[PDB]
Design a protein around this ligand. Sequence first.
Ligand SMILES: [Fe+2]
Ligand SMILES: [Fe+2]
Ligand SMILES: [Fe+2]
Ligand SMILES: [Fe+2]
Lengths: 230, 230, 230, 230
Amino acid sequence: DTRETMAFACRILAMTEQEAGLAGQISVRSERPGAYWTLRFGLGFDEATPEDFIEVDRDLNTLSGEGMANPATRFHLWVYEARPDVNSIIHTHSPWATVLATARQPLVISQMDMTPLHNDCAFLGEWPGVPIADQEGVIISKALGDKRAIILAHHGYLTAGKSCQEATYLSVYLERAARLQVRAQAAFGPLTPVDDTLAAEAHDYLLKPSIVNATFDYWSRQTQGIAPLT
Amino acid sequence: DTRETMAFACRILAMTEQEAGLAGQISVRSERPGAYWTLRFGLGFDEATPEDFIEVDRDLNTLSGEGMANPATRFHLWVYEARPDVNSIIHTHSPWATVLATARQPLVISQMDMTPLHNDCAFLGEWPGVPIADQEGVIISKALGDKRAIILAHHGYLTAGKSCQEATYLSVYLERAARLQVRAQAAFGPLTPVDDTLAAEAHDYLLKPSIVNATFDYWSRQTQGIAPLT
Amino acid sequence: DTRETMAFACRILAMTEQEAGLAGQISVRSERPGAYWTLRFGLGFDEATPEDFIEVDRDLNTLSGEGMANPATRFHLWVYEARPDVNSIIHTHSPWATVLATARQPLVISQMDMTPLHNDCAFLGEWPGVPIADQEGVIISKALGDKRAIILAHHGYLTAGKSCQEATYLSVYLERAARLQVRAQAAFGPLTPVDDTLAAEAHDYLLKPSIVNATFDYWSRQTQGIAPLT
Amino acid sequence: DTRETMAFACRILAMTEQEAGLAGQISVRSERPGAYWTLRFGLGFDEATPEDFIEVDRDLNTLSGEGMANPATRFHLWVYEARPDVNSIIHTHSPWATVLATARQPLVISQMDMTPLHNDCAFLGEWPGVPIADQEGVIISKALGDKRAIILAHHGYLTAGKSCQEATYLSVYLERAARLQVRAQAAFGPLTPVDDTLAAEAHDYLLKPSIVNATFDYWSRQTQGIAPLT
Ligand SMILES: [Fe+2]
Ligand SMILES: [Fe+2]
Ligand SMILES: [Fe+2]
Ligand SMILES: [Fe+2]
């Protein structure tokens, strides 16, 4: 169930052009403390199948499945420790969110579909370079705080969801919000943010598990291919 | 016949890249007063088949077909009531039209293919947030007036056609006009509008049912796939 | 053979995202005086097969093949009359060339692949609206002069080649040159043109029939699909 | 082995959208001095198979394989002679890197994935036009110096790798870095470069042969097509 949900999540991120390459990371908190499920080393999101997700501990020992973990995902254990409510984490350097990261520009909530990130997207202004697991773990979990997402300056983004479906939903919506903002600002300059009270209400509406799960299942069907009409 | 046209209309909107999760809506005025045909809840445009369109009433009672309707489409009944000439409605948060909506920028008619929207695209400057069907329908039918289209600030757009073909035609042409304007303004600044007399003549020419229907049938063939040349 | 070249030309324009729709036009000068070969009415470039190209006269009578011609192509006879060297004409409202057209911005030759249009792209500043065949025919052939291409303000472009291969080559290179200029100007402002003497030499190099024909045959193979490596 | 690597490299360049007619070039230094392996004339990267790479000398004599080499690649022998450490060269006029070339804008290292080009991307400000193999070879090897890549003003780019995998990795990363910079600058103006010490460390990390080869093998699998989930 978990591995199948993760495989669909990777195919959705690939379909929506996150172009994660080998810089893409995904994890789901294990029922076993101190452990997490993750895509095995050397594979991209677009090729992930349920058998490519293994269960690993703090020392990168494979507890379940066949394969070796991407050591760059070890820092996810720090986020899971700081946030008991988080059950899934995605990190990519997706094209449009990375434009915001590179220009050191926070997300400005100015449209309905940008509201799942309203008061829910942190911004790490400092780029630590090539990191260590404990260095990145400490830095990201502190900068992220209680938010669902974080733009990592000169790097990419990270989403932290209460389920793999919510982390995927946040990743897709953040990338689309970033694209919308970059295209709008190039043509028209800085955006007028929407009213905070109305944006907080749209945030909770779009983040209802029923809508998150139905949207995830829709995107999952899309990855499998739809036959044209006869 | 109606459901078959609506299925093709959805595949055309999907082909021309209008997805934003499950935000896409389409309806056709039923022959039964006070009722409408619409895509059942949980489905995207790209997967719609004739059997996924059900006839629903003001209380979301499925009168024909199998399924539950998207409750977000209830406001369509207010538009149909205001506009007896309108028989099909499409609402999406398509990528380029949503850039105009987010930047609070009306469409500027400066090119031949933008003319079906000449003096035919309203602009709702106020974003109501998460709406109640009572208020959304009143707000949108009032702002739309007698026009064929409306850009909904911080939200997306809506098209209102005399047929499903015309609503689809207006949707594709609005999205392409918005893309053209955003790309032109990013490189060169504000556009010079074309002469109003010539634009109104091109508007009526491009909106002739023979041209609207032939274009819709062409796009329908495209969605089915074309075999390469041998 | 002529119709097979035209069928491949249409598939190439479709592959390279000219999104010609029903606004796309293509012709080849007939061996019979006062006649031309053209895509029959109601069809897009992406679906054109050799049997869809019919021979037509000044009164739109079908002399060869099955079908009715697009009456909007009648003005091509005026271009053929003004230019005995021209044997093929393509007119589309392709996405990037139409940005230049809409912003009333001539092409600025600043890169190797833009040189086939160096001193070879006219600009019609006046938009005549919905035209008459004699009106458009006289206007375009006079504005085009002895050039291979013309940007038609608020409309699109037209290419005029000594062969169908050259008209196709000019269409693809003009669309790509326009995309390059719009992207460069949005990020960095107005371009510095390359030296005219060196650009005229690159123009003649890239316009050698051997290179035009080999590039056309390459694009033709691409439209047919290439099997992945095993 | 070398021919198979080159075939995959071409399919990767094609997948990552680097086409510009038949302007694409690729070579690998032969084990025989004074000779190189290259894609035979008239073929694009997307259709290359192992049998399309032939070994040729300075006079374009085919020493191995069947076919005629692209004479435009003759200048690659000058780069190989100047740089014993370089074993593969790629030259294309890819869309985004060519925007930087056309606007005479050097790459600004402001993001993690741009670091393989940190202090490793030369800029040739002078455009020589249609060149002789003679002067082109001298001009590009002098401007390239000891770097891995060079932006060629008003032309495109060239990458020079210690292996075909590294040349491919540098091309993909340069094209993506250029896209990121052009999109960021259009919306937000000039970028703030990352710290040089941290960028040099990320440069060496991302350029480790284990990472270069694993990424190349991943992209190779992607070109072959991945079946959707069941
Ligand atoms: Fe990363
Ligand atoms: Fe909506
Ligand atoms: Fe036209
Ligand atoms: Fe070149």
